[PDB]
Swiss-Prot record:
Localization in the cell: Membrane
Domain notes: Each of the four internal repeats contains five hydrophobic transmembrane segments (S1, S2, S3, S5, S6) and one positively charged transmembrane segment (S4). S4 segments probably represent the voltage-sensor and are characterized by a series of positively charged amino acids at every third position.
Assembly description: Interacts with CATSPER1 and CATSPER2, leading to suppress T-type calcium channel activity.
Extracellular side: 35-55, 104-108, 168-284, 356-370, 416-423, 480-535, 585-606, 663-669, 723-807, 904-919, 975-980, 1040-1106
Family per similarity comment: Belongs to the calcium channel alpha-1 subunit (TC 1.A.1.11) family. CACNA1I subfamily.
This protein's name: Voltage-dependent T-type calcium channel subunit alpha-1I
Residues of the full protein shown: 66 to 1738 of 2223
Bilayer topology term: Multi-pass membrane protein
GO biological process: calcium ion import across plasma membrane; neuronal action potential; signal transduction; sleep
Catalytic activity: Ca(2+)(in) = Ca(2+)(out)
Effect the entry attributes to changing I703T: In NEDSIS; gain-of-function variant; affects voltage-gated calcium channel activity by altering channel gating properties; changes current kinetics and left-shifts the voltage dependence of activation; lower channel deactivation kinetics compared to wild type
């Protein structure tokens, strides 16, 4: 119409979108200047100005809303409420108008104020790239519901188990004796807590409940030992972590299960439960880890990648001076370039030598060498423009880069006054990048990475917007509520706070890395309310398990002599090597000399070595060492066999040379380490492991270039970290550690001059610290030390240099990018192998696939006995009572069962317990009635043929068994121990399984998992073998590291120490999860107070190698497991 006409022109004018984006950005700026810790009710000039612009912004938003209203119409596809995002604009407009109106009525209620945060979310509409990305994301979300329902199953099952077992067990501490008589001066707490205000509680075990630690394990206090008086323990207090970790409700059990899904703080609560209830809850936690933290979030990744690929295809389917000549020959020689390459490489090596407490003369040689080098590059500069000319020089931009390098270098040389020596020193590292001009494959790899980054940019903006909105939300709801209680005269704010936008963004980034996020969860959820955990749940879920799976999908679909007896010999030797593994699993550093077991191990070693020598001799006489082709040593496995047997025999002869063992004990150590490597021939003696190792090594080469690039950035950032932090990683740990500036005052107060274990003194230490950072574990402490750094020999101060966030966060982002590139490279590499073999046999399967369709033609009607029950009193049962009409009632009763089992908690009222008993009775009645009606509906044939009514009968049988036993508790007919009653109550959870029949998508997804079990099973076997090797090796290396008060451990707390084989297998499992593994490796590399030679041994060289190798190998195996599942998923999708 005419009124629409005078306005519609501006609406589709792109300058309208431009000015809209300008006001959106101005609004984001105004939201970014919130200071909840200081902005108390807007009594400031800045607050007034910000409120004024907020009013102006609201005026403009209302104007644009109403104008697009009078230009599009209402309630129609073409109308204003046509886009999803226009409805959102409507919502912000109404919400802000309500907020303003309530401000008019003197009802502030800054809980409608927090709706501001959704205002930046309108910018998704005004960036068309963001519109497209978010549109595909939202259109692929609705197919994520299947894995969301699997998530619900694994949360509900484990939550019910937890609330049934450990409801209120977390609350019990060791209290004083009931009638405690004291002379006076009441100072004892009612119970025992080691650190002030329940920093680490002392959760006991009740009498009757066979826990582990039971109030007689209290460390005696060293006046009189007060801790011996804490005799009895009862279940009344607050429960740990400021009432945050418990199993009272089912909401709290969900919180704890979500904490162990993210693999953070897992072991601490595992030991909580072990102390409170029983030793055998590690089964619960291991199964929860394997099912949830590995087969849930990775199934989320698989489903999101596949669904995003499918959405990409779907929307795509809708569309479908004579020396100048002579001087050149030296230049383009392909050999002078190699000489200058050695020049640059030794320049890099020279830059790497520098370290802390560097000798006076060595650094002097370093500057001399730098001058020589830069003279060489300047000579190259002069030469290559003379024989070429200026324009020929400027043709290649690598020449521009080299010119910048040479000018920066020469400027740095002559700038020996100030400025140059401090920053142009940092620009020295750019000479390392010149190597890209020389490796041809690395040009191609970085070109591929730039091809990817063409599409990562829009995702980076979307992630930046997500982090901004969530940081502003955190500022609003967690502003100035994190203040730690006073310990030195004042309440210092927590480092992981929300007091300002910078700290909000860094803390949200930390949470997205899921490192120490549980600390922030506790500190914030105990401050506002227990419902505040929804903020972190929403943030972590949408970030890690939606947005990052989206990025992974973006990358993957942007890329896309005598006789021979050899019948049962291998199996007999396989049994023998298994027995060797069994006898390897006992060589703990605890059996005393001359033991009965020691003699057994020696004799077993002798016999096993003899048997393996016999095996080698038979193989070699069958083949010959290297006497011609197809000999013994022409396969890698056979070389490993010969190597192992030589190691064993040399170890035997050296052990028999024990007379005079001085200076050869190191040889003994090395040969014992190789004994621990020995249980490895299983790979050669098994087909599945051999093929899987071949597949691993085949899938490792293509990502070789990306691994090399990642190592190059590791070296570059290591040198940069050395430059930035030389001796700044020292701190004076003491009782005060306050009002002291430099270490001189530290020695005056005699506290200690402690040196952080993860520092940047050397370049090796820089590399170890950078690996710890890259593993996203313990990286927050390293970042804190970085920000605190001041200079060589004075105390670091809190947030001294907030500019190092750039270094420490850019490193994490770049390494994560390279790790995703490795993952996607592995996926596409496997995609080529699978696709080749797929087309042949699937076409061969399709020939037989249509035969099964012909088989269904036979299935038409084999005179089913539906009449046999007709007119036989089952006329209404077989047909009218077997359709979907009855299963909706049954699934409804199952849902009622679920919502009833979700009500038990600690100290539930007796009336609620009786109501639940009545509900359980009703559920038993309905299950029995359904089962009987089915049995009467059809004959006993399909009662077993269905493979499902069997499970239904099992559930009904357990339920009826349980209800009678609780009835036995009414008359007390026979005293039934509580164990069986509790077991059948907790087995009542099995009635959830009836939801599986209706969930066809769950069955399909879990099946698609199932036909991956060949590959997944062999990989799991190899993964367990990897644990076996590394566990034996860790027992031999680390078994003597004592863990006690004199040696304060950090990662090996109670059962994680490397003493025995199993107690080390547990800590290898924990390191595999990356939970405080950096703490474990800090524990291993530890100089002791001369109670052992190991602390003075070569541990510093070998423990980082041990842990780095283990973590990398474990992560690689898990990556390939996930890849195999993804491949079965895609292949199933194609058919
Ligand atoms: C070479 C350096 C590559 C940098 C990777 C270092 C790293 O960050 O490892 C930790 C990371 C665990 O990631 P997280 O967040 O804890 O789950 O683990 C990873 O994401 C890296 C896994 C990819 C494997 C790259 C190296 C493979 C070489 C070992 C092959 C062993 C074959 C047997
Ligand atoms: C992944 C889903 C489909 C199945 C999960 C199975 C667990 C919920 C069950 C199976 C083994 C059960 C555990 C078997 C052993 C014990 C020891 C028992 O300790 C004593 O009572 C003594 C406490 C129950 C518990 C932890 C059970 C807890 C519940 C567990 C972990
Ligand atoms: C889409 C949902 C699932 C995640 C998006 C996050 C927010 C929309 C939700 C999740 C967490 C919720 C918060 C959970 C805890 C709190 C603390 C709670 O604090 C108080 O009660 C203080 C007393 C008062 O203010 O009257 C107020 C509700 C609030 C802000 C909730 C506001 C709405 C939040 C931020
Ligand atoms: C791969 C290239 C580009 C990087 C440089 C090689 C470094 C990995 C190696 C070679 C020289 C080694 C350094 C040689 C000398 C020392 C001094 C030493 O400290 C002493 O004072 C003795 C500590 C080890 C360190 C820094 C070594 C750390 C590891 C370094 C830097
Ligand atoms: C001289 C005495 C008093 C101290 C011994 C020095 C060690 C503390 C330093 C010197 C060399 C350093 C090593 C230099 C090289 C590395 C490789 C590094 O491997 C990596 O993580 C980088 C490869 C990658 O992750 O991509 C592991 C740390 C390590 C073994 C360093 C461990 C610590 C070492 C042994
Ligand atoms: C089938 C193979 C491939 C894997 C199974 C081997 C291990 C899982 C088993 C076999 C040997 C067992 C170990 C045998 C010896 C020890 C030392 C043993 O220590 C004691 O007897 C002292 C305990 C005390 O003093 O109370 C504790 C069990 C433990 C760790 C066992 C842990 C579990 C082990 C390693
Ligand atoms: C594949 C990994 C991640 C899970 C395998 C779990 C179990 C096979 C491991 C982990 C915990 C270990 C237990 C940790 C504690 C002890 C007590 C200790 O002896 C007392 C040594 C045996 C045992 C049962 C260990 C046996 C081997 C266990 C059960
Ligand atoms: C220079 C351009 C930068 C472009 C941005 C790149 C985003 C960088 O990635 C982050 C950026 C900011 C904050 C956190 C992260 C991060 O890495 N999150 C996070 C992801 C996965 C997990 C996890 O366990 O799944 C395991 C998944 N793999 C593959 C195993 C299967 C191992 C990764 C935990 C945590
Ligand atoms: C530390 O220095 C401050 C500065 O005046 C002083 O007040 C205080 O007494 C000193 N000692 C301690 C333990 O704080
Ligand atoms: C160490 O700190 C004290 C305290 O201000 C200062 O007086 C002194 O100059 C500093 N440097 C030293 C002792 O080398
Ligand atoms: Ca972690
Ligand atoms: Ca951690």
């Amino acid at each position: 119409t005419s009124p629409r006409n005078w306005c519609i022109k501006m609406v589709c004018n792109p300058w309208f979108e431009c000015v809209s984006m300008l006001v959106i950005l101005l609004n984001c700026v105004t939201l970014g200047m919130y200071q909840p810790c200081d902005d108390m009710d807007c009594l400031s000039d800045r607050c007034k100005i910000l409120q004024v612009f907020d009013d102006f912004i609201f005026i403009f938003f209302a104007m644009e809303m109403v104008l697009k209203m009078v230009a599009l119409g209402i309630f129609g596809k073409k109308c204003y409420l046509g886009d999803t995002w226009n409805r959102l604009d409507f919502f912000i407009v109404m919400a802000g108008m309500v907020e303003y109106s309530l401000d008019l009525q003197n009802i502030n209620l800054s809980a409608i104020r927090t709706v501001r945060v959704l205002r930046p979310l309108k910018a998704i509409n005004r960036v068309p790239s963001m519109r497209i990305l978010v549109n595909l994301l939202l259109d692929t979300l609705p197919m994520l519901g299947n894995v969301l329902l699997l998530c619900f199953f694994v949360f509900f099952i484990f939550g019910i188990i937890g609330v049934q077992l450990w409801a209120g067990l977390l609350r019990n501490r060791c209290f004083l004796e009931e009638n405690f008589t004291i002379q006076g001066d009441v100072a004892l707490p009612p119970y025992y807590q080691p650190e002030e205000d329940d920093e680490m509680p002392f959760i006991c075990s009740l009498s009757g409940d066979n826990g582990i630690m039971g109030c007689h394990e209290i460390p005696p206090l060293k006046c009189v030992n007060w801790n011996r008086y804490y005799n009895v323990c009862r279940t009344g207090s607050a429960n740990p972590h400021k009432g945050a970790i418990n199993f009272d409700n089912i909401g709290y059990a969900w919180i704890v299960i979500f904490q162990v899904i993210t693999l953070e703080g897992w072991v601490e609560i595992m030991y909580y439960v072990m102390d409170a209830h029983s030793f055998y809850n590690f089964i619960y936690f291991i199964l929860l880890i394997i099912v949830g933290s590995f087969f849930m979030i990775n199934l989320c990744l698989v489903v999101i990648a596949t669904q995003f690929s499918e959405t990409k295809q779907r929307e795509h389917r809708l569309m479908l001076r004579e020396t100048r000549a002579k001087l050149r020959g030296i230049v383009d020689s392909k050999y002078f370039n190699r000489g200058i390459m050695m020049a640059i490489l030794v320049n890099t090596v020279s830059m790497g030598i520098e370290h802390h407490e560097q000798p006076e003369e060595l650094t002097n040689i370093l500057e001399i060498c730098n001058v020589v080098f830069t003279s060489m590059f300047a000579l190259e500069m002069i030469l290559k423009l003379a024989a070429f000319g200026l324009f020929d020089y400027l043709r290649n931009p690598y020449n521009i880069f080299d010119s910048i390098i040479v000018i920066i270098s020469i400027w740095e040389i002559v700038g020996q006054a100030d400025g140059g020596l401090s920053v142009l020193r940092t620009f020295r590292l750019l000479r390392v990048l010149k190597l890209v001009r020389f490796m041809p494959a690395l040009r191609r790899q970085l070109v591929v990475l730039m091809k990817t980054m063409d599409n990562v940019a829009t995702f980076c903006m979307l992630l930046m917007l997500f982090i901004f909105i969530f940081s502003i939300l955190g500022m609003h709801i967690f502003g100035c509520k994190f203040s730690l209680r006073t310990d030195t005269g004042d309440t210092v704010p927590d480092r992981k706070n929300f007091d300002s936008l910078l700290w909000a963004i860094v803390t949200v980034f930390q949470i997205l890395t899921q490192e120490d996020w549980n600390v922030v969860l506790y500190n914030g959820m105990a401050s506002t309310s227990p419902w505040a955990s929804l903020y972190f749940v929403a943030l972590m879920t949408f970030g890690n398990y939606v947005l990052f799976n989206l990025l992974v999908a973006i990358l993957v679909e942007g890329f896309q002599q005598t006789i021979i007896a050899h019948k049962l010999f291998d199996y007999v030797v396989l049994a023998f090597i298994f027995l060797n593994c069994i006898t390897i699993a006992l060589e703990r550093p605890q059996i005393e000399a001359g033991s009965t077991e020691r003699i057994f191990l020696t004799v077993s070693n002798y016999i096993f070595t003899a048997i393996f020598v016999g095996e080698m001799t038979l193989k070699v006489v069958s083949l010959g060492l290297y006497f011609g082709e197809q000999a013994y040593l022409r396969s890698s496995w056979n070389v490993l066999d010969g190597f192992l047997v030589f190691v064993s025999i040399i170890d035997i002869v050296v052990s028999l040379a024990s007379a005079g063992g001085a200076k050869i004990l190191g040889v003994l150590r090395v040969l014992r380490l190789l004994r621990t490597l020995r249980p490895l021939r299983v790979i050669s003696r098994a087909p599945g492991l051999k093929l899987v190792v071949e597949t691993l090594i085949s899938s490792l080469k293509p990502i070789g270039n990306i691994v090399l690039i990642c190592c190059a950035f590791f070296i570059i950032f290591g040198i940069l970290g050395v430059q930035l932090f030389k001796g700044k990683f020292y701190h004076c740990l003491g009782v005060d550690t306050r009002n002291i500036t430099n270490r001189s005052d530290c020695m005056a107060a005699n506290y200690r001059w402690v040196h952080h274990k993860y520092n940047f003194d050397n370049l090796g230490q820089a590399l170890m610290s950078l690996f710890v950072l890259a593993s996203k574990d313990g990286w927050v402490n390293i970042m804190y030390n970085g920000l605190d750094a001041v200079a060589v020999d004075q105390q670091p101060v809190t947030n001294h240099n907030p500019w190092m966030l750039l270094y420490f966060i850019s490193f994490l982002l770049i390494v994560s990018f390279f790790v995703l590139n490795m993952f996607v490279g592995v996926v596409v590499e496997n995609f080529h192998k699978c696709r080749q073999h797929q087309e042949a046999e699937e076409a061969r399967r399709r020939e037989e696939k249509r035969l099964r369709r012909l088989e269904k033609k036979r299935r038409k009607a084999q005179r089913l006995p539906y009449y046999a029950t007709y007119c036989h009193t089952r006329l209404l049962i077989h047909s009218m009572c077997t359709s979907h009409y009855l299963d909706i009632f049954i699934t409804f009763i199952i849902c009622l069962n679920v919502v009833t089992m979700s009500l038990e908690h600690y100290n539930q009222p007796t009336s609620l317990e009786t109501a639940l008993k009545y509900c359980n009775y009703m559920f038993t009645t309905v299950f029995v009635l359904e089962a009987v009606l089915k049995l009467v509906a059809f004959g006993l044939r399909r009662f077993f043929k269905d493979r499902w009514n069997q499970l239904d009968l099992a559930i009904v049988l357990l339920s009826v068994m349980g209800i009678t036993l609780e009835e036995i508790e009414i008359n007390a007919a026979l005293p039934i121990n509580p164990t069986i009653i509790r077991i059948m109550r907790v087995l009542r959870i099995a009635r959830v399984l009836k939801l599986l029949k209706m969930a066809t998508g769950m069955r399909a997804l879990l099946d698609t998992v199932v036909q991956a079990l060949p590959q997944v099973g062999n990989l799991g076997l190899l993964f367990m073998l990897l644990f076996f090797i590394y566990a034996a090796l860790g027992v031999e290396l680390f078994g003597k590291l004592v863990c006690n008060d004199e040696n304060p451990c950090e990662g090996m707390s109670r059962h994680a120490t490397f003493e025995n084989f199993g107690m080390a297998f547990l800590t290898l499992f924990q390191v595999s999860t990356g939970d405080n593994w950096n703490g474990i490796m800090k524990d291993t590399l530890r100089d002791c107070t001369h109670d052992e030679r190991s602390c003075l041994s070569s541990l510093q060289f070998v423990s980082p190698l041990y842990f780095v190798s283990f973590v990398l190998t474990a992560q690689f195996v898990l990556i390939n497991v996930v890849v195999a599942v993804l491949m079965k998923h895609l292949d199933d999708s194609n058919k």
